Amino acid sequence: QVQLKESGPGLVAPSQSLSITCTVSGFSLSRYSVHWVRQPPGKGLEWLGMIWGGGSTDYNSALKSRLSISKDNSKSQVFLKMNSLQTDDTAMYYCARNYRGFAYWGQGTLVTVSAAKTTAPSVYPLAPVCGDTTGSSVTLGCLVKGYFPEPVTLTWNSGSLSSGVHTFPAVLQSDLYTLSSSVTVTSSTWPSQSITCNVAHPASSTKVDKKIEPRGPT
Amino acid sequence: ETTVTQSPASLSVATGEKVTIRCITSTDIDDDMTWYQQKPGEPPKLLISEATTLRPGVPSRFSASGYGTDFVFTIENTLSEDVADYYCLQSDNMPYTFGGGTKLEIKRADAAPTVSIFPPSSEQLTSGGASVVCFLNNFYPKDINVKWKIDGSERQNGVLNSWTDQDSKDSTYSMSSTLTLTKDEYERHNSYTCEATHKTSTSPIVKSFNRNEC
């Protein structure tokens, strides 16, 4: 029952400040050290700094000038602050607890440092072509186009249809992300049973559910 | 700072073969070495503590050795679920430093793609956009090429491709290719085609449809 969770802004403009909250449970902050680590998209891990149980701080020299860590032992919360943010600070930010290694991590919060503006996605259902050769199995799809920043959460039937799914990483084109997802079921299961794509873009408070309906009369 | 050099940066092994990953520290770090496995979309997972102590619940196939400057991480019988990025970490002196990481992929038997082509949705056509999507699913090896053709003529601009990470269960890859046009340019042609050239076939796999024919 050792848990950590990062709460961050998601989208920061360059030259502005960043604040991340690490809410922990199952252990007392006064007795364990919490570390901060970041991972630029597609790159390796960088140790950012730490805060000891007693309250002393050690920061990474590279960012020491802009990095600041505090905490509140009572509320089980550790805080990260970054000044003079820049585009090369875009990364996934993790907090982790150290005891004989970084054994427990948060799931990480993605921070995109960019002046671009939040845009909600358009969600499109991708039903099979007409004709096709409907036999043995069928493949449906979901296209999520024109959104910023990452991430987006795509599920199929609220997460129940997780088998035979391929959700592809988003691609950035003209400062807007595009993402897609395929799901393969047996011919007998669709369109008999309903299949729906569930898309959430939290940075824009968007949550869309697009049902995949045949293109013709069936 | 203490620098940690991790090698190799990339690695590909057949199912069952051994994996060897090495981390050299610029200074003597005693045994303050830990090893991690990171799957896509997840944080790193601690596998080894104190250079050699396997964390409970980690398969015995995993092991590590070293004291001082030379540390080695080993997988005896690599299984499909072992695909991931692996990292070492020195915790001897500040600032803590990670190795550069090792990307592990699994060699397996050839698998031809399952290709599916999807015309633009009616909802997208109303907004003025037109995306033709081609899914190329569960193939191996990762190398593959998609050629879009409109009325038999190759189209290059406006294509966005994306690959999944190697699958943890069957060790295959999948890809999405999306050709984005204007509703106008889309309605100006008839046959749309995505051709996949893969090691699994000399004649490319073709999926196509006609705009007005259905």
Author numbering:
A (entry chain A): 1 to 218
B (entry chain B): 1 to 214
Lines from the paper:
Positive supernatants were retested, and in parallel, a cross-reactivity test was performed on an irrelevant meningococcal glycoconjugate. This resulted in a single hybridoma cell line that secreted an antibody specifically recognizing MenX-CPS, which was a kappa IgG1 isotype/subtype. MenX.01 mAb was able to induce bactericidal killing at a concentration as low as 1 μg/ml (rSBA of 1,024).
Then, we produced a fourth Fab - IgG2a recFab-His. Functionality and an affinity close to that of the original MenX.01 antibody were demonstrated for this Fab. Therefore, the obtained crystal was used for docking studies as confirmation of the NMR data. The CRD of MenX.01 mAb shows an extended U-shaped groove running from the heavy to the light chains. Fittingly, the negatively charged phosphate groups of MenX DP6 may, at least partially, satisfy the positively charged surface.
